[PDB]
Amino acid sequence: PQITLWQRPLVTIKIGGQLKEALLDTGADDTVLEEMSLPGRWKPKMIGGIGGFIKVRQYDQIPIEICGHKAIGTVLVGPTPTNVIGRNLLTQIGCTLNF
Amino acid sequence: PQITLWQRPLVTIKIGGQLKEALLDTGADDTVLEEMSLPGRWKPKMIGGIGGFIKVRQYDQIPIEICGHKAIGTVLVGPTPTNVIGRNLLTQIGCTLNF
Numbered sequence A, B: 001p002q003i004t005l006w007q008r009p010l011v012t013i014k015i016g017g018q019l020k021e022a023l024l025d026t027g028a029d030d031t032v033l034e035e036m037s038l039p040g041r042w043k044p045k046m047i048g049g050i051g052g053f054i055k056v057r058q059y060d061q062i063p064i065e066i067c068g069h070k071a072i073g074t075v076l077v078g079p080t081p082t083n084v085i086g087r088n089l090l091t092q093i094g095c096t097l098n099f
């Protein structure tokens, strides 16, 4: 569908058996979620946005469902002030910017 | 046009007669640019990012071209790792998310 930008583009995703609200963010390279548990291996990483850097755990090959679309990708978990869905997953659902 | 997200959505903008590279970011409420000079008076603003909060200079009613599309709005100037075009201006150029 078409999502306007008059308001923040928030969507509900299903991950790790949990439902969470996240922001569709074309500016984010990868998806970043607040503290949560995920199975499998992970590696520490630092990501820097406005305000500085934060440390997160990188999990790969994580199943995620967005807008009824079942996709798989990388999820960064850490002290982010807000849940964000990044390009690494947006591409999988065929999301594009148009104007 | 239609922009896919396999790569960062970087585009050329024009402000103050100068061309600059900027990222179309649907996760940003506002537009923040790297240090530069703008006319008129500015107001203070505190914005929050993934790493914390930063102080920026707010300039209003500033002309700016994005991918050739004309806009006139609020621009924030502060310590950002990259120029980011936020929803305040994406709405002016008629940009939307589609999938």
Ligand SMILES: COC(=O)N[C@H](C(=O)NN(CCC[C@@]1(Cc2ccccc2)C(=O)N([C@H]2c3ccccc3C[C@H]2O)C[C@H]1O)Cc1ccc(-c2ccccc2)cc1)C(C)(C)C
Pocket: A023, A025, A026, A027, A028, A029, A030, A031, A032, A047, A048, A049, A050, A076, A081, A082, A084, A086, B023, B025, B027, B028, B029, B030, B031, B032, B047, B048, B049, B050, B051, B080, B081, B082, B083, B084, B086
């Ligand atoms: C309402 O505030 C905003 O819209 N803020 C924008 C912002 O950061 N938005 N992010 C969304 C945008 C965050 C961006 C910004 C960016 C873009 C280009 C170059 C460098 C950095 C970011 O931090 N990114 C990093 C990221 C992410 C994943 C993986 C790797 C990396 C490295 C960085 O590139 C990419 C973007 O997603 C979501 C958000 C929303 C509310 C609060 C809040 C939570 C509680 C209180 C107050 C605010 C905090 C964060 C500004 C750009 C305007 C600051």
